[PDB]
Amino acid sequence: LSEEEIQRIFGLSSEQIKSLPEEXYKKXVEXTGYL
Amino acid sequence: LSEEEIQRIFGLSSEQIKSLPEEXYKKXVEXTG
Ligand SMILES: [Cl-]
Ligand SMILES: [Mg+2]
Ligand SMILES: [Mg+2]
């Protein structure tokens, strides 16, 4: 799984891809339906 | 994506899917370490 694939799959912005594990976790939370 | 699709995409173990955001972050880190 590449960084580019993650960006596309989770719709990440240019700023969000600077913090992939954290902005993984957040788009994880929105996965579980809590946000 | 469903939680099951996340398990498939990331290859998450039985235990790991119980903590999806955190075990999300860790398989995030493993991009390159
Ligand atoms: Cl599925
Ligand atoms: Mg970081
Ligand atoms: Mg569950």
Q: In angstroms, what is the resolution?
A: 1.1
What token pair was written down for B3? 């939680």
Query: Contacts of residue A32 in chain B, CB cutoff 8 Å?
Result: 3, 20-21
Which residue range forms the structural domain that includes residue B32?
1-33
In order of A6, A25, A34, A35, B14, the CA distances from B29 in angstroms are: 12, 11, 23, 22, 20
Nearest to B25 among A3, A9, A21 (CB): A21
d(CA A4, CA A26): 17
Query: Contacts of residue B26 in chain A, CB cutoff 8 Å?
Result: 21, 24
Experimental approach was X-ray
d(CA B10, CA A10): 13
Number of domains in chain B: 1
Interacting residues of B23 by C-beta distance below 8 A, sequence separation 6+: A28, B10, B12, B16, B17
Of all residues in chain A, the one with the smallest CA distance to B25 is A21
Interacting residues of A1 by C-beta distance below 8 A, sequence separation 6+: B9, B10, B27
Q: Is the alpha carbon torsion for A9, B20, B18, B26 positive or negative? A: positive
What token pair was written down for A7? 């960006």
